Structure formats: C-alpha cells, structure tokens
Amino acid sequence: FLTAVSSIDTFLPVLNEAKLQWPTSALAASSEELLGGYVGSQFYLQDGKYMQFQIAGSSNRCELRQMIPDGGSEIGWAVDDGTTHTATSSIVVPEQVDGVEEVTIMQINSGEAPQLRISWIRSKSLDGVAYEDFIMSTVRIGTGDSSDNFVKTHLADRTAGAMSFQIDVKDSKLTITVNGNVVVNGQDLSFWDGTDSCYFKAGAYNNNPTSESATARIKFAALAWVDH
Ligand SMILES: O=C(O)[C@H]1O[C@@H](O[C@H]2[C@H](O)[C@H](O)[C@H](O[C@H]3[C@H](O)[C@H](O)[C@@H](O)O[C@@H]3C(=O)O)O[C@@H]2C(=O)O)[C@@H](O)[C@@H](O)[C@@H]1O
C-alpha cells in the first residue's frame, strides 16, 4: 500500500499549481487529480515526508509541470516580463542504480527549448575538470546542438542529506542557490527575451540511461513555485 503525496499538507500548494506527466510528456494527470489522491509507484509519499518520483527508460519522466493555480490552464511566462519567477526545493538524491546516467530534477522549459535543467550527473568533465556524482546546471544560450549553445556548471557534489535549491529569474537574468550558497549569479537569459511560454518543472526526467530498465529515483522534501 502506497501513501498519496496529497495525504499531508506539505506539497498541496505546489500540487494546486501543477500537472503530472508520467511516463512521457503527453500522458498527464491534472492538478485536480493530484489533489484528489493520485498515487502509484511512480509518485508516492516515502517515509511520511518525501514526494518521491521514479521512472525508467530513455527520456521517460515522472515530472510536475507548472500550471496556473486553482484549476488553471498551462502557465507561460517570460524571462523579461518584469516579474521574478522563483522555484524552491529541498531534494534528497539517493544513490542512483547502475544504468542511470543523468536525471533532470528541476527545469525551466518552454515551447522552444529548455532554458535551464538542473540534473544529477554520474560523471562528466567540465572546463577541464572531472566531476562525479554531482548536480549540474545546463543553460541554453542558443537553439543549436553543439556545446557552444550551452553553459554547464558544477553546482555541488551529491550529498547524503537534503539539498536546497532556489532558482530565480528576473529581468532576463538567472541566479541559482544551492544549500544557501550562490552557485550561479546573473547568468544571461536574454536570448529568450520575448519567449512567453516558459514554465517550471520538477521531478525525475531520465536522460541517456545505459539500461532501459534502470529506475531513476528522486525524493523531494519541499517544492514551491512563486511569482513576485
Ligand atoms: O559533452 C557534452 O557536454 C555532452 O553534451 C551532449 O549534448 C547534450 C546537450 O549538451 C544537452 O545536455 C542536451 O540536453 C537535452 C536533454 O538531455 C534532454 O533530452 C531535453 O531536456 O533536451 C535537452 C536539450 O536539447 O537542451 O542533451 C545532449 C545530449 O546528447 O545528451 C553531447 O554533445 C555529448 O558530446 C556530451 O554527452
């Protein structure tokens, strides 16, 4: 028997502003369904306190997608609309099983391309330095495929305990704070000026696994998205 995330109060504010995509982008459960006790092995309350996402398969996901609150439709905002768009979370990333290589855990996405992904990464060299078992940001500065279209940053090595995140977008600039420490300040997002389709996401999006059956697993102790 699995306990529903909505059975406690911690996640109700964000569930009231999200739909869940599982196991792919096109298969969704509404905010109303989440508030109404949606539960499954893919999305359940773990140890009485974690909103836990699980997903296997290349590019599959179990992921919340920001909605207008109170039964509203899909949100779309802009990096340059004057409002500060903020996502906060507290995440326990457990040890990922063999075959899981990268798990996107928070995003800014849009109708054009992902402006930002925060992901757990098994192993990667960045700017001549090798990192392992760590949390990375990937920011798009163009629409192409080559590395010049991205800015990738080591944020923090994965910790045993919960790790806090804050993503702030204001006036075409991005700041990321991890465990209270600024790890990106004032990253330019002006390429995306006028893109009015941006939205936050969070959960587990499984990128480039080496096994189709290996299940990514991510635990949220807190998640909120706000505007101000
Ligand atoms: O050497 C590197 O830096 C790696 O980057 C690879 O190309 C990446 C690309 O930089 C980026 O991470 C992209 O991200 C996509 C993501 O995985 C999801 O599929 C979805 O969110 O869309 C993202 C996007 O298009 O922005 O994925 C590719 C990738 O192949 O994983 C390669 O250049 C490779 O050399 C290397 O692993």
XYZ file of C-alpha atoms and ligand atoms in Angstrom:
265
model
C 0.000 0.000 0.000
C 1.373 3.375 -1.096
C 0.571 6.648 0.660
C -0.503 9.539 -1.562
C 1.553 12.718 -1.664
C -1.652 14.740 -1.150
C -2.345 12.963 2.175
C -0.148 15.507 4.007
C -0.147 19.295 3.717
C 3.482 19.854 2.676
C 3.011 19.628 -1.095
C -0.569 20.837 -1.509
C 0.408 24.378 -2.612
C 2.556 23.113 -5.482
C 0.146 20.312 -6.429
C -2.503 23.056 -6.759
C -0.180 24.612 -9.391
C 0.986 21.533 -11.300
C 0.005 18.652 -13.513
C 1.976 15.397 -13.538
C 3.470 13.926 -16.706
C 4.117 10.190 -16.495
C 5.683 8.199 -18.118
C 6.024 10.680 -21.009
C 5.217 14.329 -21.687
C 1.950 13.559 -23.472
C 0.426 11.385 -20.694
C -0.692 13.596 -17.827
C -2.760 13.750 -14.654
C -4.346 17.068 -13.759
C -3.824 19.203 -10.675
C -7.308 18.191 -9.539
C -6.319 14.520 -9.805
C -3.106 15.129 -7.840
C -5.011 16.925 -5.083
C -7.569 14.104 -5.171
C -5.098 11.456 -4.053
C -3.236 10.379 -7.199
C -0.705 7.732 -6.191
C 1.395 4.992 -7.760
C 4.880 3.545 -7.586
C 5.947 6.419 -9.849
C 4.739 9.130 -7.417
C 4.101 8.472 -3.730
C 4.880 9.723 -0.234
C 8.030 7.993 1.012
C 8.822 7.717 4.732
C 5.925 10.024 5.531
C 7.610 13.118 4.128
C 9.108 12.753 0.633
C 7.329 13.343 -2.649
C 9.201 10.572 -4.468
C 9.413 10.259 -8.256
C 10.527 7.062 -10.008
C 10.958 6.409 -13.731
C 12.823 4.024 -16.035
C 13.527 4.266 -19.756
C 15.289 6.645 -22.131
C 13.793 10.147 -21.955
C 10.850 8.977 -19.872
C 9.740 11.130 -16.976
C 7.650 11.453 -13.879
C 7.575 15.210 -13.632
C 5.400 18.075 -12.402
C 4.650 20.821 -14.939
C 3.747 24.292 -13.664
C 0.103 25.310 -14.069
C -1.890 28.405 -13.250
C -3.119 27.832 -9.663
C -6.608 26.711 -8.668
C -7.546 24.557 -11.643
C -5.986 26.906 -14.170
C -4.521 26.067 -17.534
C -0.877 25.737 -18.569
C 1.253 28.664 -17.496
C 3.571 30.513 -19.829
C 5.791 33.321 -18.576
C 8.795 35.205 -19.942
C 12.275 35.833 -18.596
C 11.793 39.531 -19.395
C 8.213 40.092 -18.192
C 9.373 42.074 -15.121
C 8.099 39.501 -12.613
C 10.529 37.443 -10.545
C 9.899 33.750 -11.161
C 11.187 31.599 -8.320
C 11.290 27.854 -7.767
C 12.475 26.423 -4.467
C 13.015 22.845 -3.414
C 14.673 20.533 -0.941
C 15.797 17.298 -2.586
C 17.315 14.042 -1.384
C 19.047 12.383 -4.327
C 19.649 8.766 -3.252
C 22.279 6.604 -4.876
C 21.243 6.026 -8.480
C 21.307 2.440 -9.704
C 23.579 1.202 -12.470
C 22.366 2.311 -15.867
C 21.073 5.691 -14.675
C 23.451 8.353 -16.035
C 21.670 11.721 -15.776
C 18.415 12.690 -14.075
C 16.906 16.116 -14.601
C 15.276 17.188 -11.340
C 14.246 20.831 -11.972
C 13.742 22.756 -15.204
C 12.716 25.929 -16.872
C 11.198 24.709 -20.123
C 9.268 26.469 -22.852
C 7.674 25.955 -26.208
C 11.069 26.408 -27.867
C 13.859 24.707 -25.885
C 14.828 24.082 -22.235
C 16.220 27.308 -20.828
C 17.538 25.505 -17.756
C 17.965 21.977 -16.477
C 19.297 21.096 -13.043
C 20.371 17.466 -13.195
C 22.198 14.791 -11.294
C 25.120 13.510 -13.424
C 27.141 10.327 -12.869
C 30.392 11.515 -14.476
C 31.412 14.499 -16.596
C 34.358 16.744 -17.361
C 33.543 20.469 -17.313
C 36.117 23.045 -18.441
C 38.971 20.587 -17.946
C 37.873 19.325 -14.506
C 36.378 15.879 -13.920
C 33.385 15.664 -11.586
C 31.459 12.626 -10.373
C 28.080 12.006 -8.738
C 27.143 15.665 -8.805
C 24.461 18.255 -9.507
C 24.866 20.354 -12.654
C 23.081 23.242 -14.324
C 22.673 23.357 -18.096
C 21.557 26.719 -19.502
C 20.764 27.193 -23.174
C 22.126 30.337 -24.827
C 21.066 29.285 -28.341
C 18.968 26.739 -30.212
C 21.766 24.681 -31.777
C 23.102 21.313 -30.693
C 26.829 21.977 -30.265
C 28.397 22.745 -26.897
C 28.565 26.477 -27.688
C 24.773 26.581 -27.221
C 25.024 25.681 -23.527
C 26.571 26.862 -20.290
C 27.136 23.943 -17.933
C 28.156 24.461 -14.312
C 29.082 22.158 -11.449
C 26.737 23.200 -8.642
C 27.530 20.720 -5.857
C 28.532 17.123 -5.332
C 25.578 14.943 -4.370
C 25.066 14.934 -0.607
C 23.742 12.297 1.738
C 21.223 14.747 3.191
C 18.609 17.024 1.691
C 19.946 19.726 -0.600
C 18.098 23.006 -1.041
C 17.702 24.766 -4.374
C 16.447 28.173 -5.369
C 16.083 29.249 -8.991
C 15.379 32.962 -9.519
C 14.642 34.554 -12.900
C 14.273 38.328 -13.090
C 14.952 40.793 -15.908
C 16.490 38.194 -18.230
C 18.962 37.011 -15.569
C 19.230 33.698 -13.704
C 20.540 33.049 -10.203
C 20.866 29.579 -8.689
C 21.430 28.998 -4.965
C 22.257 25.551 -3.542
C 22.216 24.932 0.219
C 22.019 28.695 0.661
C 25.172 29.346 -1.408
C 25.050 31.186 -4.707
C 26.470 28.964 -7.440
C 25.321 30.986 -10.495
C 24.670 34.740 -10.402
C 23.328 36.867 -13.219
C 23.506 34.283 -15.990
C 22.136 35.870 -19.136
C 18.799 34.624 -20.471
C 18.281 37.451 -22.973
C 18.356 35.049 -25.936
C 14.920 34.028 -24.637
C 13.545 37.574 -24.405
C 10.004 37.542 -25.743
C 9.559 33.769 -25.286
C 6.266 33.893 -23.363
C 5.898 30.111 -22.957
C 8.326 29.397 -20.104
C 7.345 27.302 -17.111
C 8.917 25.413 -14.235
C 9.143 21.632 -13.942
C 10.439 19.321 -11.237
C 10.633 15.585 -10.611
C 12.633 12.948 -12.477
C 13.410 13.050 -16.198
C 15.748 10.226 -17.177
C 18.378 11.296 -19.731
C 20.596 8.924 -21.729
C 20.443 5.827 -19.498
C 22.542 2.836 -20.499
C 19.790 0.419 -19.415
C 16.118 0.816 -20.284
C 15.011 -0.936 -17.084
C 17.112 1.041 -14.585
C 14.803 3.170 -12.439
C 15.794 6.729 -11.557
C 14.537 7.815 -8.136
C 14.399 11.323 -6.655
C 12.917 12.447 -3.310
C 11.532 15.951 -2.686
C 11.151 17.182 0.886
C 9.800 20.522 -0.383
C 8.854 22.137 -3.684
C 7.288 25.509 -4.415
C 6.977 27.869 -7.325
C 6.034 31.506 -6.802
C 5.942 34.792 -8.681
C 6.611 38.242 -7.238
O 29.953 16.855 -23.996
C 28.850 17.237 -23.528
O 28.747 18.350 -22.941
C 27.653 16.354 -23.662
O 26.626 17.151 -24.344
C 25.847 16.344 -25.331
O 24.794 17.128 -25.913
C 23.799 17.301 -24.904
C 23.493 18.762 -24.736
O 24.679 19.455 -24.267
C 22.378 18.984 -23.777
O 22.735 18.498 -22.469
C 21.148 18.231 -24.237
O 20.082 18.349 -23.286
C 18.866 17.798 -23.614
C 18.405 16.900 -22.531
O 19.302 15.740 -22.380
C 17.005 16.407 -22.726
O 16.969 15.481 -23.809
C 15.982 17.537 -23.032
O 15.803 18.257 -21.979
O 16.567 18.400 -24.178
C 17.890 18.920 -23.803
C 18.320 19.936 -24.851
O 18.236 19.655 -26.077
O 18.741 21.060 -24.468
O 21.436 16.783 -24.439
C 22.567 16.497 -25.315
C 22.835 15.032 -25.159
O 23.205 14.348 -26.152
O 22.695 14.489 -24.028
C 26.768 15.801 -26.407
O 27.411 16.903 -27.076
C 27.808 14.904 -25.834
O 29.051 15.131 -26.549
C 28.071 15.038 -24.352
O 27.423 13.953 -23.683
